[PDB]
Every structure is written in structure tokens, then in C-alpha cells.
Amino acid sequence: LPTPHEIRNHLDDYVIGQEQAKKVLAVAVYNHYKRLRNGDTSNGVELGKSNILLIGPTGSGKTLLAETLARLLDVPFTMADATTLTEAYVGEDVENIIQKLLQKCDYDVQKAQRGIVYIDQIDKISRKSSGEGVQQALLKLIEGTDTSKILFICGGAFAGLDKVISHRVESEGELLAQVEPEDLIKFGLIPEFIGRLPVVATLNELSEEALIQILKEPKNALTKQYQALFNLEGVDLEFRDEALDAIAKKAMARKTGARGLRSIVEAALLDTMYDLPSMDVEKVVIDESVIDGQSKPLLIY
Amino acid sequence: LPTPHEIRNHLDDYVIGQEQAKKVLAVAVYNHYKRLRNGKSNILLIGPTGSGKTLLAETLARLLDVPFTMADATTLEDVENIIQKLLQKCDYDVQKAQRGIVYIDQIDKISRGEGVQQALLKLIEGVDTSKILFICGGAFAGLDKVISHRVSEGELLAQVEPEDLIKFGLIPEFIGRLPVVATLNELSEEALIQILKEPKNALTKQYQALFNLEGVDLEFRDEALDAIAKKAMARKTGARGLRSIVEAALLDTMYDLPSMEDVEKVVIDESVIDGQSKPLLIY
Amino acid sequence: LPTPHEIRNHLDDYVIGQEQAKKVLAVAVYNHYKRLRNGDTSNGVELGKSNILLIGPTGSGKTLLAETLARLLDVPFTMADATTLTEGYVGEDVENIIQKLLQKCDYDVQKAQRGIVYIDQIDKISRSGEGVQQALLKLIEGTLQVDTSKILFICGGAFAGLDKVISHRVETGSDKASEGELLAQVEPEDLIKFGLIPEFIGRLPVVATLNELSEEALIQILKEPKNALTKQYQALFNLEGVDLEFRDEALDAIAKKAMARKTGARGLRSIVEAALLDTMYDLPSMEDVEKVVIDESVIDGQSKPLLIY
Amino acid sequence: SALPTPHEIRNHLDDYVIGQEQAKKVLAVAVYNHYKRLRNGDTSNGVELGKSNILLIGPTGSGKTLLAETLARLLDVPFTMADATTLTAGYVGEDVENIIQKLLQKCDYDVQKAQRGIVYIDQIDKISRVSGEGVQQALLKLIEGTEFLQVDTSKILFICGGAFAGLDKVISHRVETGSGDKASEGELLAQVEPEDLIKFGLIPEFIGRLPVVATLNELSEEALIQILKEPKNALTKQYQALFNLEGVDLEFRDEALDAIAKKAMARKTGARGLRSIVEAALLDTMYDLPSMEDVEKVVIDESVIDGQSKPLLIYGK
Amino acid sequence: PTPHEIRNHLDDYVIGQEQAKKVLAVAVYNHYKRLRNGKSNILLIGPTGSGKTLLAETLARLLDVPFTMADATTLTEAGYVGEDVENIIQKLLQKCDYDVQKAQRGIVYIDQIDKISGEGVQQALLKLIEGTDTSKILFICGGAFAGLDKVISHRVKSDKASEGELLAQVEPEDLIKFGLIPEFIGRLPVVATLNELSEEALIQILKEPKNALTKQYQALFNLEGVDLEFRDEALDAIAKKAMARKTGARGLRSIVEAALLDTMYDLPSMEDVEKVVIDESVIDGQSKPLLIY
Amino acid sequence: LPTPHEIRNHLDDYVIGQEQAKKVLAVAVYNHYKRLRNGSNGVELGKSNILLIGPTGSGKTLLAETLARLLDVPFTMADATTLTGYVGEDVENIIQKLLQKCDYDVQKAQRGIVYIDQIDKISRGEGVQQALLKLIEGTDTSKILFICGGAFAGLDKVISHRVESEGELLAQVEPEDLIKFGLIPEFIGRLPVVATLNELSEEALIQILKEPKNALTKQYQALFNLEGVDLEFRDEALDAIAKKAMARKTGARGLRSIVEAALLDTMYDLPSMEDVEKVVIDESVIDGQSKPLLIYGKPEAQ
After folding, report:
1. Alpha-carbon distance values, C205 to C32, C134, E41, E263 (Å)
2. Are residues C204 and C224 in the same domain?
3. Do C192 and C155 reside in the same domain of the chain?
4. Does A200 touch chain B (CB under 8 A)?
5. How far apart are CA D249 and CA D297, in angstroms?
6. Distance between CA B172 and CA C157 in Å, rounded?
7. Residue A125 is part of which domain span?
8. What turns on expression (chain F)?
């Protein structure tokens, strides 16, 4: 098994920032499978399963984190939506997420027990005051009937949670750290459900400096990918710092997070990529070319 | 023998606050044994987890030198096992056994357990399980809301009525056997402390087993457990906020533990409440 | 066997009011056991078993009535809650009722067949709850090896909603006399619209309605029954060598307050105990001759009981 | 032994049920053919015999339920009732098996007897068309066939009774659309075709399994009267036997019986509301009867419909 | 044969449906005309017993071309549907004498395609319409489409629109909303509609199918040791009455059961050799079936 | 390889309008195969599957088939509706149907293009998105290009609810807009390239009837040609067909049904008469009133 140190390190390669949330997941995950290999019992005491609750803005990395730690653990992974299952056959449907897990699991019961399950938009199922019924149906899953062995991760934006925390205690990232199970209670989640989610991870909103960092530093960074594309044409693609900043700015205005990044970049390079193979030594993308879209990239011969 | 005045006085030494609940327990208990000495009233404890429910029960049993036994509704013929468990601590003396006290925890959990209510009810009535006093504790997390709807949370509990319990999930015949109802508003620091270490699945025990897989011995100093309870009462989350407090104090330690060779680890309070110092590491 | 007349007379001693319902029960009961003694068959035709359905507000005497008529017939009695039957199929729960009957019956099959079974809160299972009606329905008919046929079944229920559906039907293509007068017009189909299945209602031919207890009734309940609250507390204060007296105005005040809460005779004890709590607490530490509870002490709770030395 | 001819089966139905001659003729044939098929086997000869489950259509309290119970009795065959509204969640298919185990219980756990058994589903019109429709399809798997007995629900006979309040109108509209004679429910229920059930809410594949359709005529005043005295377990006979244990002779003037019927028609409960009407009229009498010395008691219509007068008491001994 | 000639020959086998016969004539002619010179597939939409199957079988005879029938329901709900596909081809090859040439000229009729909209079958069945060579053969898909008439109405003139006319306004989009996949409909460019039932089809339904009503009742009467016979005129009278009610093949059983009800009732109480059902017994219901001792 | 310039030029010949969508496809396609040929340098290039968003009969399917032809690459179609239990066998079936037209060659198969129609239909079905998602990545289905077309009738409204003509609005489309529509995040992330199609103009419909290689007019003219007859469509007639096609809003789809109806009678009794040529006017099409004009070849008669 990989030490929490190792797991976090490999998470740093797929996700930028969120160091705290990653440290948490690393430990929660490590202890989880460490329990399975040794058995829930022993020694004279029954260890407790520790399902995870991911709390962060949309486009923060919640889903990616889940998919990633499943990959670096060569463990079968499956996604599900709390809203898609919110209304339906009812709870009978919830068992189907197991057959979807079994499918990617090759029908092997042992690997399936190792599997990880990510439930998205769990904050949506809580009543604003049918959705609550789902929490209880999905609650039966969390315990087991065996769904016990498998790890459950539940992500959500929790837009309102931010306010109730400020209210109870009377700085966005700071407030999230102060979150308590009772705060989720006032949000709409039932006590018996939250008790099944002991491990609570908070994800900070991406900074303008973060987006910039995401554009160039990751191994699969957008800039690196396009530079490699322009590289096949024998052309050298260069992004000015001011340009990267301009992209981030525009990405925050749309509040899509790191998601709207690629769409912004591809649009700024669309024209260039089109008539490139029919003509250069290198091409330079300035902020005037990105945010304004008025000027075409600089062409060097 | 002990007057209600005297009984409450002795209760004040074991639990703090809850003057009303204690006044009620004193009278209920006094009347119960007073009717036995001269030859059908029980108690229902409603309060948050860690409010002293269990302690109060255990206490009034001690100050009455009467055999005491606990039982959990979650584990409810195990019914007859509660009497033989009472008989064991009773030395198998039928007389002392009938004077015995029985505390049932988490009865609010069995209110949809409904088949348990009837089975547990036959006991309350009537070894003749008629003379023994029954005290049933429960959190009743939902009861606070139904009382409000019947038309803050502390004053509301005072207005609780058997009908409210009916809407909660308790059957009429069961509630009729629990005429006396006492409510609690505050948690007991000592209770929380007790919860952290004494239960079979106590937090401390769980983490000790976790650290055990690493071949490391985890030790909680008493001062530490008390610092955890204190903080838990400041947030008024009850026994719920306990785990979140403990995990946070052990988070760092759990992270870089599998990468070092330690004999044992000691969590002092300065590590918990202050969070300023890391646990002590012994090689 | 005691004539229906005699049965009703002995019910008058344990229950206050409800003269109509008691007349019904008396007849139903009398006919039931009269059938068992002569056999369901004969002569050339099969008599029909007549289980009862009690419909009345909470704390009106439904349970007491059942318990009582069991006593004055020296017949084994057992209680059960329809709610407990819902918590799956509970075929074992359903049959559990019989072994609990057998226990109080001394394991005697004959006495068990004579037994009476009261199911409380049946209105609660009206349309997992339905499944219970059907499972409980198998009981009513019959199958320890004991046959549940011979045994009488009484099913009580508040039926809060029933009052409205009867009005919706009996209305005229308002106002209705009263809740009690409306209950009298109750019909098997009205129970149908409430949530009870036809096959179940057909097994409950005898329908008895209970009117809300009067303030004068509540007062009567506080002092006249053998186990009256006032008598119980007077005996309690008696152990301390003190004489407890309730002024008539006080008993009235208790009733008044009990009707405001609409708990019926149920909320009586909680009211009385609250008024005497303080007094019971510091009583064993003082020397009094007697104590007097006035209406100012009960309804207002502002003044403490009068202490005589 | 030998099976009872349709003739014989109808004759014995006459003893327990008043009127409904046509319906009874139908059920008789449907039932006779059913068990004749089981004895001979579904296979052969050179052709596959078709199972013929029955669909009872009649107003509430018209004898649908009784008719089912009866033909079961006179065929010494295990019988079980079920309610369609109970099945209509997802554990309906499980409760389906519960109908079989409830049959098995009364069957003495014998697989052969169970296969002969009869199953009556009440209020099928209630589940008409999404959650209700699903049940039709879940109950439809039953009709065909598949602590477990592993028996095939095929062999057993299925009867499905329902009021079909709206069905009366849709049939009229089908006939009204073309050729827009007296409306008469009777000359309409007889005209009903499977497609009419379709427009009502029943799925095609379901109706196809209910090939035999027996309709029940609304009870006349005369029928009710006839029901109160002529059947073997008639109300009057039952009460007369009750009053007989007291050594008293109970008599119902014909005038009383009609007054009961009238009142029963006003409530439109059918034969159901009959017992309730009668017991209310004899309640007082039954109460103070055991405490007095009478020769006989006479119930007049003034005692029933008006309830103002108590029964006439004759003294003798 | 010219489309003129083809229609003329179709008139001799089926009555009415002049329009659908005109379309079929053109679709068929164009299909084989393109083959001779080296996807004009047909979709039949009509109530059950309108002649859909008869039409397909007929134009196959008048073109001396191998014909084969298939049921979409047999294929559905299985993974061996793709294999049963080749089974349709080998079934076509058998009646074709295993001559590849004649096989490619063959016609294939798929019945109850509206039933599968089953959607995994549309795809499986689609790969056939295209080609592997199942390209040259003509495909005709029949269906009742009971729900289709309603979606066309909703798709949206005074005095409303007759059902026989509403179907003439059918469009591929309407089929889409019905349940058929776009790629499947695109392979069935030719759509023919029928407004009238076929007396001859219904008659055919009463006696020829393996589970035919007449066969069923004959077996029932067989258990009594009685021989039940249906005179041709009787079967005809049943069909007629069935068309007046426009219930289709559905209203057949109800008609037959009524004509045999009395007889079935008092049959087990008498000793007969056989029983004959005439049209006077069916349509008029005035005379009881006829009893040979 | 063909430059995006060249690819777009050849698309112009088969598809009318959609200049923007075709510019996008050209780039996406070009970069895709350019990646396969080269596999570097020190960074991993990202596969760029395409998501076609446009009304029915706008050219989505045609575009896909076309760029497959002008790249001599195996092509296969599939419908997201047929994919809706798990249908793991259906999902992989798309591969064997691709292998069939691919001649069982693994290399050509990796080059293949796959078009999934009606993806908007399976929007939150979700299970299919995830099963189809495993495809997009690879298990190798990685090398092959995926194009997913959909009408997204509701998408137009949600975009307006956020951004607050139809074609101008589609240009403002964002991955989050698809999210609110019903598509799962992990699926949209696999569809980086988004192309929007404009509604076709009447001039376009007219252009589609006569100019494409498989144009309807050409197909029927070849049909009438086997009878030795010359079929001619008057400009006014082609215009009348387009008009009627726009009234039904079926797009280029309802074109054939319109044309076939106008030539039905004629095709029926044609093989039974001796004509030189046939002229279809706008009166015969939009009105359905007058039969086509029949011109008789010189006898022949004697």
C-alpha cells in the first residue's frame, strides 16, 4: 500500500492546490483500504469505516480527485448523481450503481469490494425547508447489505452551507474549515447520513493566480498541450504572462472554474490553427489576442 | 429512607445543573421505594447525548445501595437476559433484585423497534419484574420539532406531552407505563469524557487500534480527554462533534506516521485544545 | 352467562358515559360467547362471528372498556398495537399475539379460544401498513395449534380523519349536529374511503362509536373510579401522615385544562402531578396535618397548596 | 371422481347467490373448462389449449366476491383473496409471491392442490392507467406463470372483480359515436368489448389474459328482498337462529324486508349494507331479550324504515 | 410488370387500399428495376388484419420471387437476435433453393416492428437493411402502430380529421416520437398506410394460425369427445361482424365465444357425435348450433 | 495530410453553409490525425473529440460522413437511443461494426471515425453517458475520433437564461450550459471541441436539391433515365420544394418525402407509356394539382 505521503504526491500531479483536502483524502483513503486488508474486526475492537464528504465550489477538482485516487490505487471507480437518483423505482435504482461498479469491475466480487463510489451533488438532495427519502435510501448503501467494504465519496458545492456556518459561529476558505456536522444538519442533511460521512474535506475556490498556475505548471497543462500541437507543425508557440492572466480573468467572469479554460484558449487559437498548416518559425499569443480577440497572434518568420 | 430533598442533594455532587430533572427523579424514586416498603410509576429521561442521563441513573442507584443494570434498546429473548444480568449484580437474591433499578438507553431509536416496544412493555408490567424501577433514556432528536408543531428548544421540552411522544413513534401503551418524564438541557463534561474512553467503540479505543496497525502505541492523557470534552461543549454539538475534534488533533500525526519508526505517541491537551504543539513522539 | 343488561351494568361501574357504545358491546359480547357455547353451526345454518370496531377519540375509554368486559367475563385478555405489526410482513408478530394470549391463559387451549384481543391504533395502518391489514385479517378468521376463530377481536382507533369523510358523504346535495351525532351515521364505505380494505371491514360487523368525555365526566373520572387520581395521590400523601383534599373547584379546573389540550382523560395525570410536584418534593421534610389544593393552585399554578399544621 | 357439469355448478351457485343468471352461466363454463383442461393437460392434442382467466364486472356488493368464494367451495379447491390497491412501491412483485404463499398456507403446502386453487383479485379497475400500470404488468407475469414452492402460477385460475364505474360511460360513447334505443346499463355491459377496457386504463396484454368476461346486473329491490330470506345463510335465517337460542320465534313481515331493501338502495352499498341495516333494527331487541319471557317477536316495516317503533312482543311459553 | 399491372394483380387478392397498392406497386417496381440495371424499402402502417401480410405475400408471388416472414418480437430481448438474423436469411435461402442470385431478389416481411419501439433490435435489424449480401433484397416492415395515430394528431382542419386521413399526414418525425430510431426510419423511405380491414385476412386468422380460435375451441370440444366444425360461410360471417365493430382481430374471440356459449353450457349434459356452426348461427344468432348424434 | 484549408474546401462541396462549423471541424480533424501520426515532446497531447450542436436536418450527419470520405477513413454511425440496460455489448458493438467496414484491420480501425446521433436525448440514460464515456477514453478506442451530434432543443433556452438570434446564442454556449442540460461533467470534458450549426436557408435547401453528388434531383433523374426518359426540374419547382420544406421545419430530411410525393403518380404510369422527357414545374410540386408536363418523342409511331 502507498503511504499517505505517496498518495498526496501523486494527487499533486493531477490536481493543483487544495493541499489540505488532499492530505485529508490521503489519510482517509489509506486507513480505509488498510482496514479492508486487515479486517474491520481486530483487535478486540471493530474499526470504523470512514466515508468521505467533499465540499467545494463547482470546478474545484472534487470529481477529478475521486477519479485520480482510484487510478493510483488500481481500483474500480464509478460515478453517480445525487439528483439523477433524487427522483425515480426509487431506492431500487441505488443498487444499480453497484452493477455499474460490477461492470467496470469485471464482475469480480473481490475487486468490487475494493471499489470507490463518488456521489455528486449531494447538497441538492437536502430539502430547502422526496429528496430526504433518497438520503435514507442511499444511507442503507453506505452501511452495507456487500457495500460495506467499498469506499463512498460524496461531493457537493453547498452554496448555502457557507452562510449557515457564518451564522452559527457568528474568509471563504477560513469559514469552510470551521464546518461542523451540525452545520450540515441545518443545511438539510439528516443526522444518520452525516454520521456515515466522518471524513470532511473542504476545497478552496481557485485563485486568479491558481488558474494561471493551472495553465502552465501541470504535466498536462493546456499551454503545454497546444505547444506540442504547434510543435508538430515545426512551429514554436509562446504564451506571454499577460496572456495567461487574461485567460484566467475571463475564466473567473464565467465562474466555470478550470473547466472554461480550454474553451477560452481554443477560441483564441482557432483561427491560427486553421491557417497554420498552410504557411512560420514561431507564434506569440499576447493578452490583446486573448481577452480582446481583436488582434491575431504575432507571426515570426 | 432518603428524602427527595436528600436525594437531590446527593445528585448535585455527581452531575451539575439539571435542577428540575433531579427534583423530579428524587420524587419519582422516593415514591417508588416508599410504595414498595408499605406494600406503578416509572421514569422517562429525555435529553441530548452526554447530558447525564446514564450518570444520573447510575448515581441514584448508588445512593440507594440498590443493584443497577444498563441495557441498550439497539440490542433488544435478550429481554430475560436483562433480569439475569440484574440478578448477577444482585447476588441472585430475589428480594434485592426487586428493589433493583434498570436503565434502558436509546429507546427513541426503536420508534420507527416497534415490536421491541411491546416485548419491552411486558417487562415494565410484570422473577416478578413489577417491583423494579424502570428508567428509559433517549435523545429524541425529532421530538423537539413535533412539540413545536403541536403549538427555545429547552423551554419547549418542558411542554412535552405523551401525545407528542405518540407522534414520535412510541405506542400509547408504552408511554402509559412511563408516567414521569424528565428533561435535560445541558451536557456533562464528565459524561463526554466517559464517552471518549469507556464505550466499546469509544473514539480513543478506535484510534488506538488504528495506530496499533502501525505498531505504535497511542496514549491519551486524562487532561487531553478533558480538553476534548470542553471544546465539544463550546460547540454544543454533543457527542457528535467529538470525532471531528479528535481527528483534527491526530490528522497531521496520522499523515506522516507510516513514514517514521516510533514506539508510541502521547496526546497531551496542549496538543488538543491549543493545537499549537504536536503529539509527543517516543522512539 | 350474564345478560347484555348485566354486562352493561358492570361496565357502568368502570366506565363513565358511553351508554350507547356499551349497549353495543354488551350485545356483541353476549352473542359472541353464546355462539361458542352452542357452536358456530346449528341449526342447519352457520352463525356469523361478530368482531368489534371501537371508534372514539384518544382517552375516551376504548382500552378500558375492552379490559373491563374481559374481567367481568373471567376471560384471558391481551393487548396489541397495530403500529408494531407494520414494523415487514410480521407473520411472527401477528402470531406472537397468540402466545402472549396463551401465557396469560396458562397455556390452556380452551381458555385461549374464549380470550379477547384488543388491537389499538388500527386507523393508523389505513392505506406496508395495508399489508398488515391483510396479515391481521388472516387472524380474525382463523387457522400452539389454537384456532383464532373462537377468540373475539376488538379493534380500537381514533380515526381523526373519519369524522370529515362522513360529513362529505352525509352532507346534503352546514351544519352537522355534532361529532358524536356524525359518528352515529358512520358506514362501512366511510371506513373504505379512510383506508381500510373491504375484506377487513367485513370482518368487523359490530361498530361502536364513542363520544368525547364531558367536563363533568372528567371531573367524575378524577374522584369516583376505584383507581381515581385523587384517591391515588391521597393515599400517597397518606403515607406521610398527611391528609390531601381536593376542592371541587380544583377538580373542575383540572378538567377545564384537560379539554383545552384535548388529550382526554390521558392528560389528566400529567396535570395533577404538575400541580402537586413541588408539594410532594418538600413534604417529607415538614410536619403538616393536611394539605388543600384549590383551583388557584391548579389552573393558575401561581399559588402553592394550603398547608395546615 | 368426476367433475360437475356447468349445469350442476350453476345450480349450486343459485343456492348462494341471487340473480346474475347470465354471469353464473359464464363462470360455470369458464370454470368447468378450466379444470377440464388441467385434468387433460395443457399439452395436446396437436394444439395448445388456452387458459381462460375471468374478469368479473359488477357494481359494489353485487356478488362478485361471493361468486368466487362459492365456486371454490363447491369444487373443494383452495381459495385466496387479494386487493389490487395493496400492490400498487416496487415490492409489488414480492407481494405477488405473497399471494401464492397465502394460497399455499390454505393449500396445506401441497403443490398439487395449490395448482388447482382459485385466486380472486379485487378492485382491478382501481389500478387502471404509472405506478398502477406497473402493477398490471407485474400481476400479468403471474397470470401466465413461472420457503419457496417453485410452482407454476399457470395451472391456477385467476378471477378479477371490479366496479368499473367509468366503463359504463365509455361503452356508451363507443355506441354513441356510431348510430347516434334505450341506454339501459344492461344492454350496454353486454355490449362491452376488450377495446373498451383499453380506453378505461387496462393494458392490452393484460386484457388478453382475461378472455372470459362476466357482467353483473344491478340488484333490484326484489333481488335484495330475495337475498334477505332465500339464500342458505340469509340474514333473516341467521337472526332467527340467534333468537331461537333464547327460545323466541323471530318473524320478518314481508313488509319489513322490502323496507330494508329500499333503505339499502338509498345507500347504494348493495347487499353489503344489508347486515348493518338489520342489526341496527334488532339491536335494542337483542339487548334486553335475554332478560324477558317472550313467545315470539315480530318485526314490521314501521320498526325497520322508521325505527320509531320497537318490534312487537308476543307472550306465551 | 409495370406498376399498373402490379396494382391490377393486387386488386385480385385484396380489396380496397387503392393508395397503398399504388405505393407498393411503385416501390416494388423501382426496386427490381434498379437491380436489373445494376434502398427503396417499405414501411406498412395499418390495423391488424388489414391485409399487410397478404399484400407482402402477394407481390412476391406475382414476381415469382422467394418470400419469407419474420416476427420482430421473437428477436427482441435476446443477444442471439443477431444470429436469428442470419436465420431469416437461411430461411430465405431454403425457400430459395440456396441460389444466391434468387435470394438477393427475395422479399422479407417483418411483422410487428411497432412492438420493438426492442431498441437494441432496431440496430441489429438495421445492419441487415444495409448489407453485410442483404442489400439487394427488399424489406417490408408492417405494424399496427396503435399509438402513432395519436402523436400525429398532437403534432397538428375544421370538423377535425378522419383517422383514415390523419395517417396520410404521417411523417418520419412522428415515427421518431413513437419509438423508432432515426437511422432505422431513414432506411424505410417508402411509407404505405391502410384504412380498411381485410375480411379475407380475418378469416385467415380464425383458422390458419397455430393458436387459431377455431383450433382452440375444437380442442375444447374435443375433450368432450365432440367434433366441432366451422363452415366457411360461418367464418366469413364472423369476420364481417368483426369489421362492423372495427375492433380488428381483438373482437374475434368475443364474437366466437358468444356463438358457442349456450352450446358449451349444456354440451357436457348430452351425447353428441359432432357440432356444426353455420353463418345462421353466428351472424344472426337466431339458430342454435347444429347437433349430430 | 490535408490542411484545414483544404478540408473545409472539400466540405463546401458536400455541405451548404455552416462555414464556422466547417472551419472548426477542419481544425479538430486535422489536429486529431496529426496527433496519431506523431504519437512528445516531453508533454502528452490531448485527444479532441467533437460535439455537433445543430437543428435536425442541418447537416450534422452529412458533415461526419463527408470528412470521413475525404480522409479515406472507415466510418460508422450509431444512435445514443439504442444504447439506452447497461448495453456494454451494444457499446462495444459500435467497434465491431467499425471493424467490419474497416476490413478487420486494427490500424485502419484506429484511424476510424465514429458518429453518435441524438446524444442530447440521453441527458439526465445517464448510465449510458458513463458507459459511452469509457469508450471515448480507451481500452484501443483512444486513437479513433468521436463526433457526437444532437439537436439540443432545450439548450437554446438555458443559454439565454445564463447569458442574459438562435445561431448567435449557440456561439455563446459553454460546457456548464451543457451541464444544466443533463450531460455529466466527465463526459463534456471528453468533448472539448464544440461546433454549432445554423438553421438552413431556403437558398441552401435549393442548393442541396441539385448540387450535392447524391442530390435528390440527380437521383430521380437517373431513375427516370432507366426508362429512357429525361427528367427536368424547373428552378421555380426546386424553390417550391424548399418553401414547403421550411414550413414543416423538418430541414433537409423532409425533402425526399416532398419530392417523392410529387413524382409518385408519374413514376407509377411512366413505364407504361412512351415519353421523350418530363418537366416538373412549381405547380406540380407545391400545389400537387397539375401533373408533370409530358413531352413525346417523334414516331416511332410510323
Report:
1. 12, 17, 68, 43
2. no
3. yes
4. yes
5. 6
6. 12
7. 4-202
8. By heat shock. Part of the clpP-clpX operon, clpX can be expressed individually from its own promoter.
Q: Which residues of B touch C90 (CB under 8 A)?
A: 115
Compute the distance between CA of residue D207 and CA of residue D213 in angstroms, rounded to an integer: 10
Residue D1 lies in a domain: no
| Cα nearest neighbour of D41 on chain E | E223
Task: Provide the 10 A C-beta neighbour count for residue A38.
Answer: 14
CB E33 within 8 A of CB F226: yes
CA distance B99 to chain A (A): 35
Cβ E205 vs Cβ E212: under 8 Å? yes
From E193, E213, E237, give the residue that closes a domain.
Answer: E193
- At E62 the three-state DSSP class reads coil
Residue at D269: amino acid letter: T
CB contact under 8 A, A180 and B235: yes
C-alpha cell of F144?
A: 479513433
CA distance A84 to B225: 43
Q: Is the dihedral of CA E257, E261, E263, E266 positive or negative?
A: positive
Looking at the structure, tell me whether residues C81 and C112 fall in a common domain: yes
Tell me the sheet residues that pair with B217: B264
Tell which D residues from 6 to 65 touch E, by Cβ distance under 8 Å: 6-7, 25-26, 28-29, 32-33, 36-37, 40, 45, 47-50
Q: Mark whether B95 and B194 lie in a shared domain.
A: no
* Grid cell in block for residue C285: 421534610
Q: Do B52 and B170 reside in the same domain of the chain?
A: yes
- Which H helix or E strand runs over D298? strand D296-299
Contacts of D29 in chain E (CB under 8 A): 261, 264-265
Considering D215, D248, D269, which residue would you say is the last residue of a domain?
D215
Neighbours of chain E (3+ CB pairs under 8 A): D, F
How far from A106 is each of A80, E17, E248, F87, F138, CA to CA, in Å?
19, 55, 49, 14, 16
Exposure b/e, E122-135, CB count within 10 A at least 16 = b = bbbbbebbeeeebe
Distance, CA of D141 to CA of D151 (rounded, Å):
14
Cα F84 from Cα B121, distance rounded (Å): 53
For residue C278, give the CATH number of its domain. Answer: 1.10.8.60
Distance CA E192, CA E56 (A): 12
Task: Please state how this structure was obtained.
Answer: X-ray
**Strands of the sheet with B264-267, listed across from one edge:** B217-220, B264-267, B280-282
Side chain identity at B266, as an amino acid letter?
V
DSSP element (H, E) containing C25 = helix C19-38
How far CA A82 is from CA of A118, A123, A135, C83, F190, in Å, comes to 10, 8, 9, 32, 22
Q: How many CB atoms lie within 10 A of CB D105?
A: 15
Q: Retrieve residue D179's grid coordinates.
A: 348510430
Query: What domain count does chain E have?
Result: 2
The length of chain D in residues reads 317
**Resolution in units of Å:** 4.0
Angle between helices D254-267 and D221-229 (to 10 degrees): 120
Longest dimension (CA), chain F: 85
User: Does any domain span residue D249?
Assistant: yes
Whether B263 and B174 map to the same domain: the answer is no
Q: Are D305 and D262 in contact (CB under 8 A)?
A: yes
Closest chain C C-alpha to B4 CA, distance in angstroms: 6
**CB-CB neighbors (< 8 A) of C21 in chain D:** none
Q: Which residue of B has its CA nearest to C103?
A: B122
B142 with C236: CB under 8 angstroms? Answer: no
Q: Which residues pair with A120 in a beta bridge?
A: A81
Q: What is the DSSP string of D1-69?
A: --PPPHHHHHHHHHHHS-S-HHHHHHHHHHHHHHHHHHHH-SS-SSSPPPP--EEEE--TTSSHHHHHH
Q: Which residue of F has its CA nearest to A251?
A: F174
